[PDB]
Amino acid sequence: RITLKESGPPLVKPTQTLTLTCSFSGFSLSDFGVGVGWIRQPPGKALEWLAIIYSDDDKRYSPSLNTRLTITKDTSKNQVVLVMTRVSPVDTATYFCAHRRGPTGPVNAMDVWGQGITVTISSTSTKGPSVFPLAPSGTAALGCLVKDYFPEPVTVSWNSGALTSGVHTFPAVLQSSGLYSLSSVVTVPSSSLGTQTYTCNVNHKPSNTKVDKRVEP
Amino acid sequence: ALQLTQSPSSLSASVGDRITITCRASQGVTSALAWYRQKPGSPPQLLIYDASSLESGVPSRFSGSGSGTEFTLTISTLRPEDFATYYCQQLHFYPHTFGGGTRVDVRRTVAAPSVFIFPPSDEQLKSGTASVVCLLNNFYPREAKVQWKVDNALQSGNSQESVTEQDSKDSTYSLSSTLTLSKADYEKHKVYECEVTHQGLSSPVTKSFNRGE
């Protein structure tokens, strides 16, 4: 049946242009009234309508982003392209392209969506993280601050995977510096503080950076 | 511009519950309203189109109704896979607006967060920056407020936070907030305070530490 898939650069520089391509099958932009639209979603935010193009090259853009967007279609390749100019960190989001049925009611929706492509806007270069302790002093909490790395993702385990219960590895936040920062914590018996050892194992594959940080009071 | 308002923005429920959710439009959109369910990490999935038509392949428990400016999505009996975010979209006027979404999560008894504060490490201070973090562990509901204070001065614009997905086993959330200061500002002050507000707390709780002490 119908399927769509977004492709393009996962990383883009502030000020630069973002070019995304929607390749589809199971239908064709020739068949009357058919549309292919673009919708974005900032991490944890709501869906935002961007633009849509139809079989007859008819076109519509979101008013607010109109002077920054350009949408085209190539019938020879069953692809729809979206070009967004002068991007900034706020454009960081997941971009989805979707299909809209043509006049056979059923036109009132976007029935099939692509998996979506994650795009991150940062002026940053690949960089390994610095790993700092979140020291503890009934239940006690302790952890590791995995700071200033790029790009996602990074992995964190405790005691080489032997420690899993009570672990909370938080979603990373993209700082204004363009570098990520994330924390991983684990809750344990205060009585265990003096005998058991706690070490977070950090791995940032992108930079081939591995760090083992032993944490204590 | 045409605004689409979804209510409630967040809602807690249990498996087997009957819930009804609404989407309001600032202007008449006839029957051009669609409903989507979105599970984390996955793209939105069409449930209802043309305001009341159940999309093929979509389970019978889902139903929609409305016209003009008022619309509703009802789930006769929610299932575990329904704990997600729902969005409505109107396709009558350009641009094709989406609502702000309704988050449906798993209900459990109110649980106050266990709070901990972490001073910056001496190792990090050499870098010229001091990160002090506050942890709110295993709480419910999700809404929580963290306020940072340094020598009783309310901090604003210099903190960031992130929250975990609701726990599969205990249905709680945890939150981490990081206050970032220059080393100079950190050595210049004494008390670092993390104040937490949450329904499970009769009164806000404050965890703190004195930089030298």
Partner: peptide, 5 residues
């Protein structure tokens, strides 16, 4: 602007 359909 009104939608196409």
């Amino acid at each position: 602007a009104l939608d196409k359909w």
